[PDB]
Amino acid sequence: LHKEPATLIKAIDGDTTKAMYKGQPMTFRLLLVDTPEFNEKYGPEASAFTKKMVENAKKIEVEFDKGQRTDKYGRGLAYIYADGKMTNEALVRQGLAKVAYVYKGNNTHEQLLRKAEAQAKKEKLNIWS
Numbered sequence: 375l376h377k378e379p380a381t382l383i384k385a386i387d388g389d390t391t392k393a394m395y396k397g398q399p400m401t402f403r404l405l406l407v408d409t410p411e412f413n414e415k416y417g418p419e420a421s422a423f424t425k426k427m428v429e430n431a432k433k434i435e436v437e438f439d440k441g442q443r444t445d446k447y448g449r450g451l452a453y454i455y456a457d458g459k460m461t462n463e464a465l466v467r468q469g470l471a472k473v474a475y476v477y478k479g480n481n482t483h484e485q486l487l488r489k490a491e492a493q494a495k496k497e498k499l500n501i502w503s
């Protein structure tokens with residue numbers, strides 16, 4: 375897989391963000407994770423975590439997997455990197471997202487993220503507390 379440029383347009387919630395990609399505005403949904411909705415427990419904390427990560431970065435990058443690049447809603451499906459650090463993994467490692475929506479053919483980083491989840495759950499963090 376390859377990292378490609380994007381620029382933050384606006385934070386949305388723990389697993390979605392609006393970014394400009396190839397010069398067009400898109401809503402991205404993070405691959406392989408599920409954060410709580412803003413109205414659910416840890417929802418606001420997941421939103422805040424992603425917002426800080428993406429806003430504070432000097433650069434963001436999007437990395438598509440081998441399969442579908444957009445979902446049925448027209449959202450981009452990607453791994454999003456903030457100054458080289460993967461937001462999808464960082465959410466899972468903090469217990470602010472579960473590994474989820476693991477579809478065959480768009481699951482390159484599955485095991486990386488499952489390892490992060492096992493660590494979060496061993497540490498009883500957030501959703502696992």
Ligand SMILES: Cc1cn([C@H]2C[C@H](OP(=O)(O)O)[C@@H](COP(=O)(O)O)O2)c(=O)[nH]c1=O
Nearest residue numbers: 403404405406407408445446451475477480
């Ligand atoms: C993460 C991801 C979500 N989706 C779809 C499945 C879910 O459909 P439904 O809307 O019918 O439940 C929805 C979950 O997104 P949200 O967690 O953002 O609600 O997005 C994909 O199709 N591909 C994906 O990789």
Ligand SMILES: [Ca+2]
Nearest residue numbers: 408409410411
């Ligand atoms: Ca969600």
